[PDB]
Structure formats: C-alpha cells, structure tokens
C-alpha cells in the first residue's frame with residue numbers, strides 16, 4: 001500500500017539493507033518498476049523529480065501510482081518528491097498525495113538549510129509525510145548530527161562522493177566510507193545515497209550495440225553500493241541506469257525495423273530491460289524478499 | 292466530462308459532423324489527444340483496443356482517462372472499447388468504466404452477428420453504456436434490419452476502408468452511394484474504420500527520420516470530408532498518430548546518440564501527435580463544438 005516513506009526506511013535502517021528509490025516519468029517506467037518489486041518481493045520507493053512532475057502533471061503522477069498500488073496491494077510503496085527546490089513545491093507534493101518529500105537546500109549555508117528544512121518538516125509532518133534533506137556539496141558529520149537533531153528530518157542525504165547523472169567519476173570510483181560511518185553513528189537515522197546508478201556492463205553494452213554513445217560515463221560499482229549499505233545507506237537513488245536500459249531497446253527497435261511504428265513494439269522490450277535492472281538492484285541492495 | 296458515447300455522437304449525427312475517435316496505448320498518446328481537444332474546443336472519443344488494454348491493464352486505461360477528464364472537465368469525453376471480440380470483453384469494459392463498447396462480429400453471418408450484438412446491447416444498455424457494431428461491402432437492407440432489431444447506438448458499415456497504412460493497392464475509392472443509403476435507412480450515427488489519411492507532412496517526417504512506409508496509402512482528406520457529408524460521425528484514427536509519434540522518436544535517436552532522457556524523445560513526439568489530432572478535428576468539423 002501507499003505508506004509513509006519512513007515506514008519503509010526505518011525497517012531498512014534497523015535491519016541494515018538498502019531500498020532502491022527509482023525515478024519515473026511515465027507509465028512504462030512505473031509499470032516495469034512495479035513488476036520488478038512484485039517479482040523480487042521487495043518494497044518500493046517511487047520517485048518523481050520536479051521536472052517529471054511538470055511533464056506528467058502532479059495529478060497524473062500520483063494517480064498512476066495509486067492505480068499501481070491497488071494492483072499490487074501487498075507491496076509497501078512510498079511516493080517521494082525527488083529534489084524539491086522550494087517549500088511551495090514540497091507543499092504541493094504533500095497536498096497532492098506524496099508520502100515523502102525531499103527539500104534540497106544543501107547549496108545554502110548550514111543555518112539557511114536548517115531553517116528551510118525545518119519549515120518543510122513541520123508542514124510535512126503535520127500531514128503525515130516524511131522528509132529527506134541534504135547536507136554537503138563533503139558532509140561535516142557534526143553538522144549532520146546537529147542538523148538532524150534540530151530539524152527532525154526523517155532521513156538525510158550526506159555528500160560522500162557521488163553526483164547526478166552518468167559522468168560521476170573522472171577516473172576510479174571513490175566514496176568516503178569513514179565519513180559515512182561517522183554520520184550514521186552520530187545521526188542514527190536512515191541515510192540516502194544520490195547519484196547511485198552503476199551503469200552495469202550489460203546495460204552499457206546494450207546501449208552501445210544500439211548505436212548509442214555513453215561518452216566514457218562511469219557509475220558507482222556494485223561493490224561500492226554494497227559497502228554503502230553496509231555503512232548505513234538505506235535509500236539508493238537510481239534513475240540513469242533505468243533510462244539507459246530503456247532507451248537502449250527503443251534505439252534497437254528503430255534500427256532493426258524501419259517500418260515499425262507500433263509504440264508497444266518499442267516499449268515492451270524497453271520495459272523488460274528496465275525491469276531487469278531494477279530486479280538485480282533490489283537483490284544487490286538487500287531489499288528482495290523483505291515483504 | 293466522461294459521458295455516454297451516444298451523447299457525443301447523437302449531437303454529431305443531428306448536426307452533421309464527424310468526431311475523431313483516437314486510439315491510445317499510454318500516457319503520452321492520451322495527453323496529446325486531450326491537449327488537442329482542449330486547444331480546438333472539440334469533443335473527444337478516446338478508444339483502446341483489446342491489445343492496448345492488455346498492454347496498459349484495464350484499470351490503468353480507465354484510470355488515466357478519468358484523471359485527464361478531471362484536468363479538462365469542460366470537454367465531453369467518451370471512453371470506447373475498440374474492436375471488442377467477445378461478450379465477456381465488452382462486459383469487462385463496462386464494469387471497468389468504459390462509456391462505449393464495440394462488438395465486432397462482422398465476420399459472422401448476419402443472424403449470428405445480430406444475436407451477439409443484441410446480447411452486448413442488452414448488457415451495455417442496462418449499465419448506461421453505448422454500443423458500436425460492424426456490418427460488411429455492407430448490404431443497406433441488412434443494415435436497416437440489423438439496427439432496428441439490435442438497437443445498437445452506432446454502426447460501422449463496410450464501404451471500402453481497411454485498417455493500417457496499406458489501404459488501397461490501387462486508387463483510393465469508397466462507396467459513398469452505399470454510405471448514403473445506409474444512413475437514409477438507419478438514421479443513426481455511423482462509424483468509419485481504417486480512416487487514417489497519412490498526411491504528407493507526417494509521411495515526410497517519418498521518411499526523413501529513416502522510416503520505411505512501404506508504399507502505404509491512406510484515405511485522402513477529400514474522402515474523409517465526403518464521408519462526413521454522407522453521414523459518418525465517428526472516424527477511427529490510430530495509424531496517423533503512431534507514425535507522427537514514432538517519426539519524432541526516430542529523429543531524436545538519430546540526432547543525438549547520447550540522449551536517453553525519455554522526455555527529450557516524447558515531448559516532440561507528443562507535439563507531433565497533438566498537431567495531427569488538431570488538424571483532424573478541424574477537418575471533420577468537431578472543432579469549436581464545445
């Protein structure tokens with residue numbers, strides 16, 4: 001059912017596994033994410049960015065998710081606003097039916113980040129909605145400790161080396177796991193990893209075989225993601241991996257049949273590739289069989 | 292708002308215009324169709340084939356449509372089951388919240404077509420849902436008896452069309468004398484299947500993106516207008532939407548091999564589909580009918 005984000009992440013926090021947070025922008029992404037969760041018996045964190053919400057309309061974003069939840073009522077589902085940029089954006093997500101909201105104010109000084117986050121928290125918590133915030137651009141663990149105590153935010157995303165998109169590491173992957181463990185120790189709350197796509201080898205091969213160009217993009221290796229969960233990460237933001245796998249198959253259908261224009265012929269194999277990415281990620285993070 | 296199919300088509304029947312009936316298989320198609328109707332102030336017929344319903348799930352097909360109607364509550368919208376093949380399929384659509392259903396038994400002999408259609412009608416009408424059936428080329432006298440006894444709300448008579456892009460291996464031709472006779476004898480809304488036109492700008496867009504249309508031909512615009520003058524009120528349109536949508540997808544794929552933001556593919560695809568629908572609404576005379 002559609003539940004508070006913290007309902008899912010407190011269990012993951014206490015038992016020591018990661019729940020993937022998967023972005024979607026339309027029905028095909030959402031269906032494949034849900035079939036993955038049903039097939040791996042895994043909780044689901046479903047994420048929509050502000051841009052995704054503008055593309056779908058927030059009424060359709062929430063509406064499609066609610067339909068999917070009633071289709072799979074046995075799966076714990078949180079619907080999460082990814083990188084909300086204003087109080088008003090977060091307030092609109094709360095009013096529309098989101099069960100989790102992120103307020104990203106990490107580009108501000110500590111005092112202004114805490115101020116705005118706290119404002120979001122008391123609004124969201126009044127409405128039964130959980131809150132994510134971000135600290136770092138890396139994190140100061142003692143800032144994190146104070147930030148969490150005073151804001152009462154439900155989960156925290158500390159900067160430990162990742163970044164959005166595919167072009168993460170200009171060389172070898174590097175995450176500061178000592179800093180992670182200290183944050184986790186001092187805050188004792190669920191933590192979140194942004195920019196956590198791995199770009200597996202098969203997904204990249206699929207994309208390049210379809211004539212795509214990834215441009216030397218490298219994600220977080222699987223072994224770093226597992227070490228992250230061992231360090232205390234409980235929500236693993238994942239988007240790029242899904243897009244590459246999906247568009248790989250769309251490119252492939254276009255290439256191999258120039259007369260094909262049935263949309264289902266493009267998006268059925270795209271859905272399948274995306275679902276498989278999600279299933280494997282669920283097993284990697286340790287959320288499989290957790291229902 | 293979401294309304295009986297006959298509510299939209301009775302008005303079109305009385306006032307002599309055609310309402311496009313546009314197929315969809317996902318959010319992108321649906322959104323672009325609704326924005327077209329909103330911008331042309333036009334009633335909408337939204338339809339989903341059995342295959343589309345298996346792809347989306349009937350719960351999602353109705354659910355997305357109901358969300359879209361709430362976003363544009365001033366637009367008369369009917370949600371239509373396209374080419375239902377069984378009574379049970381039509382019954383599931385009625386229960387799921389469709390406001391119109393088509394039962395296609397035209398491959399049966401007259402007596403069996405009428406019997407199955409009548410059974411669907413009794414079921415659908417008990418639930419406040421309108422019914423389309425198919426006959427056929429059509430015998431105008433079969434049509435007259437068929438409609439009187441079945442009490443179907445609208446009829447698709449075969450007059451020369453076919454589904455898909457490949458409609459006429461020779462010159463395009465429709466039997467308009469047959470059409471008018473059917474209209475005269477039945478005096479109900481009529482439906483035209485296989486009514487995609489494949490406009491030249493949509494074909495040019497598809498070929499420029501590397502697409503192959505394999506010498507396909509659609510109904511000329513002039514034939515669509517003549518069919519509405521002859522009494523056609525519901526004009527089934529699918530292929531045109533697919534080609535315009537997939538033309539832009541192919542183009543995005545071609546012009547940036549590093550693009551994998553789905554919105555970068557489907558925003559222009561939506562726009563192109565929207566414009567096809569907008570121009571079709573103006574062609575058929577449903578624009579500015581709200």
Ligand SMILES: O=C[C@H](O)COP(=O)(O)O
Pocket residue numbers: 023049050051052082083164239240
């Ligand atoms: O915040 C991270 C998400 O991947 C954002 O996706 P977006 O490209 O829709 O903003």
Ligand SMILES: O=C[C@H](O)COP(=O)(O)O
Pocket residue numbers: 314340341342343373374454529530
């Ligand atoms: O009934 C005619 C429809 O255009 C067919 O659509 P479909 O290809 O989803 O069956």
Ligand code: NA
Pocket residue numbers: 047081082083102132237
């Ligand atoms: Na987030």
Ligand code: NA
Pocket residue numbers: 338372373374393423527
């Ligand atoms: Na139909």
Ligand SMILES: [Zn+2]
Pocket residue numbers: 083164194195237
């Ligand atoms: Zn992020």
Ligand SMILES: [Zn+2]
Pocket residue numbers: 104134194
């Ligand atoms: Zn971030």
Ligand SMILES: [Zn+2]
Pocket residue numbers: 374454484485527
């Ligand atoms: Zn048809």
Ligand SMILES: [Zn+2]
Pocket residue numbers: 425447484
């Ligand atoms: Zn037909």
